[PDB]
Amino acid sequence: VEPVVVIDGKGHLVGRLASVVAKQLLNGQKIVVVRAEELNISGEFFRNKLKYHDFLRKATAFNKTRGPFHFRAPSRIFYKALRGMVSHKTARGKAALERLKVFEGIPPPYDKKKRVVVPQALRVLRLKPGRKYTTLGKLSTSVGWKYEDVVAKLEAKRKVSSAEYYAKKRAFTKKVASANATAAESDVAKQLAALGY
């Protein structure tokens, strides 16, 4: 529908976000995902911490360097949920994956580009009220991720600039509405009402 879709991970549930992201790439839609630190997983923090430690013990006994690799960053926990939903040892699969990008925070390009959401993976739409859940960033710091603070700091900075932007814009569309209303009631506008506009 658009050349590149930018997804605001915040408030999405990992494997449901993954399931849709994977399909899209396979079908040829480039996807970039931001604020993976604000991803969720159902299940209380402790549960998913225990799960993560299960993962953590699997290693190649003769050489741990060849063994399963354990990435600690929310973006990359995420990639993992994703990568495992893609026939990723096939050309067709590598190709789909090159179509993907994932970030903690919203770094340049994407901070001035619109981001969407994916309602069929929106936690607030899916999880029954009262069911505990985990935030990706908090899970990740506990298994080694080093950059929650730095991301938080940048994000607060970015969030201030974006508040300005918004404000300016909302000021501007107020003017624009003031304009659109002198033109209301005019002849060309009554005609357009007639045609559903």
Add this chain to the structure above:
Amino acid sequence: SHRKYEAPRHGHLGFLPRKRAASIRARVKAFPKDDRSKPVALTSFLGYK
């Protein structure tokens, strides 16, 4: 089958690999925490043994 007698392993797995270093000048992997209330100063120094 199970050792027989127990004894500590030989040597420390946290100093692997036992390869030659990438340089004669060992790297400083960490500097003292910063306390910006004190005057500005170096935090290390070169010399020859």
Add this chain to the structure above:
Amino acid sequence: MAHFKEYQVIGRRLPTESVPEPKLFRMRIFASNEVIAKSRYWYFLQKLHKVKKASGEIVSINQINEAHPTKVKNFGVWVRYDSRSGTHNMYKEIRDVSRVAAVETLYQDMAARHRARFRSIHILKVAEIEKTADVKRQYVKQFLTKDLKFPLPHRVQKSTKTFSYKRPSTFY
């Protein structure tokens, strides 16, 4: 077993010279179709009478429709069923708009709570509870209070495209 119709079924043991005009017995039966219905009939007659289908005959089979299908009714429901380790009688109450609707949710309920498949259940009686206050089970009494109202918090709308440009709102 499905979406139920209710049937009157009438049978009798076959006539004989010395006994022409045998007695004629009736059952109401909840089934998805008349084939299952005549089957169920023979199933219960044999738990009650010296008969079986080879020596009996179906006299009539007719669907009974609800008298007042758009009138809300409080049903009393009486069931026999088997569990994994014994067999048990039960009384339940179901609020709906037809016996037929009511019996569907019963099997559903029996399957969900007690894990009883259809084979394991005998409906003993389904009867409309005429006076509120002969209503016994509180999960229904609840819906009889005067001027009753309730909101439906946390509204969740079905998206029709995979992407959305807003950020939904569960207001309602």
Add this chain to the structure above:
Amino acid sequence: AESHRLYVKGKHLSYQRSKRVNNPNVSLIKIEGVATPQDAQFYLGKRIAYVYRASKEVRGSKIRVMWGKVTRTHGNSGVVRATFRNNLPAKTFGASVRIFLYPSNI
């Protein structure tokens, strides 16, 4: 104008297949804006071109086309099956595809 398009955008998804055998003879097509089999019934019969480029000029052009037709709908979400003059190359799973408005019945 800026738009000169007379076709609907589409996508080569897959060959027809079971869990572990595919069938290069029938392709599965996703059509933009088509979400149901009832919608997709409109496009049955419409003709379909996968358009691509090549390094070596031929009868004038450096652009070649494989032609096909939509043939039936496929499943419940608007996906469609199509056949082509020659089966589609399979590097094209995920490639864009053009669905035309002819043969027209409006």
Add this chain to the structure above:
Amino acid sequence: ASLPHPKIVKKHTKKFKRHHSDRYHRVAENWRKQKGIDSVVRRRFRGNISQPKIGYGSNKKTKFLSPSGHKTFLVANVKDLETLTMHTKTYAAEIAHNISAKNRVVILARAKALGIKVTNPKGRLAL
């Protein structure tokens, strides 16, 4: 100018090569049937080479026709060639491999006179 014929359909143009004739030089491609007790090929497990069988046989109607729709007839000399005088819509002469160049130009001339097609006219051609 061959007799009209229904479209020629070949059913299996790919050559049936012996199993493992791609794996060891000692095994020629010439079709040979597996008789082993365990062989995947003989047992026809999904994924191996198929085997020649009578289903593949061609339409009695177009069998033996070449693309031109003529059956080929091998020919050593003008007399052989002339056995096709009344069948130029049906058979085509192939000049045999061991015919000399000077005898080919005679055979070819007479074919032209009789309207008989020749499948390999350029052979040994004094060009």
Add this chain to the structure above:
RNA sequence: UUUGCUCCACACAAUAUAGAUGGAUACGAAUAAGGCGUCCUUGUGGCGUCGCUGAACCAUAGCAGGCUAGCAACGGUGCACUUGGCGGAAAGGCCUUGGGUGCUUGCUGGCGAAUUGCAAUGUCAUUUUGCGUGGGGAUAAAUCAUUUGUAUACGACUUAGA
């Protein structure tokens, strides 16, 4: 080592392409709650309004978009300039001034289109490289061999030499 390198420009030739074909259209936060307008005692404030999907918004007419005239506006927008400022998370992009110039389908005119023959993607994008031309610009090093021994099985390392 036979005139080489680099940035900008155009030119011919190639080579390609995981797949342009109107627009990736920027708060944040909450969801048992919020957006927007408005007033005010500026607050966990009053009052109004909206949702129930982007089925939107923006754009969109002209030989794939030709050649031309005028009117009403003084608006819009393309381009190359120029003024002030911002953005380091991967800023490599955003904003602002001012003159110039093109287009304007805001409205009203003149001319052109056929024969591509009843369809044939009917060719309009963006990759990397190669060769000459001429506007700027810039004028090294590494390796062998030799040498040190803080190094070394051999390579490697580490020194030294106009």
Add this chain to the structure above:
RNA sequence: GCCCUGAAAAUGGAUGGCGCUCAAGCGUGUUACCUAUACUCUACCGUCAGGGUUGAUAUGAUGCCCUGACGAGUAGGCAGGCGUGGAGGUCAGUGACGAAGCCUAGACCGUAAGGUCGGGUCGAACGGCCUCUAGUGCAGAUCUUGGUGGUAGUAGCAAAUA
């Protein structure tokens, strides 16, 4: 009923994996949808069966023509065919104006055994058809004889003072 305790083993690790919590879990119900060498219709191959057809003056009576059904296969049986050395017959067959042989991700016929051609190389002989005959068809047998590889520029070429 579901869940929880009761519930201890050795390389790291398996509801197939990812992951999933008003499920993508458990029980039950209702539609739709995906797809087997199976089922339905059709073409073509072959097998078996049942019919028709000696009437010359043209060419297969083991023929031609219509029709129906059927097709898995080790051990094994039978059948119709492909190929090789020699033999009787025949084609008054091929050939120094190039036989045989050999090479050839060139062509063509056959379901296949195989057959035919072109081009290159070559130098003296050879083939079709009816029939006769057998020392007549190889991937194997720790097969026989000969040739040849990877191993590999590798082990090594260091006892006896120089």
Add this chain to the structure above:
RNA sequence: AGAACUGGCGAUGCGGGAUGAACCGAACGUAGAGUUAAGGUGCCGGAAUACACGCUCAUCAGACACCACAAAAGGUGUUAG
């Protein structure tokens, strides 16, 4: 380890049970179109992140026949009786 009756594997590919001689479906000439079986339809992966009523929250939840195990006993967790 040994019998009975049938059906299979051995001698048999094909679709399903991830995998697998024997289970489920279905038995094979070369092909087109259609429809199904058993089994499936979040993504891997063709196919509803379909509909509907309940139940379940596990600091070692559970997840489909053959089949890849769990018992006595116990819970003021929760459910219905």
Add this chain to the structure above:
RNA sequence: GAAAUUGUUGAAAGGGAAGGGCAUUUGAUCAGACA
């Protein structure tokens, strides 16, 4: 003057083997048939 095996030349592919099946893209190559 075959094959195994080898040198050079030319073309191509190559993220823990290679080779194979069905299908098509791309390159190279080629028969036939038109009149």
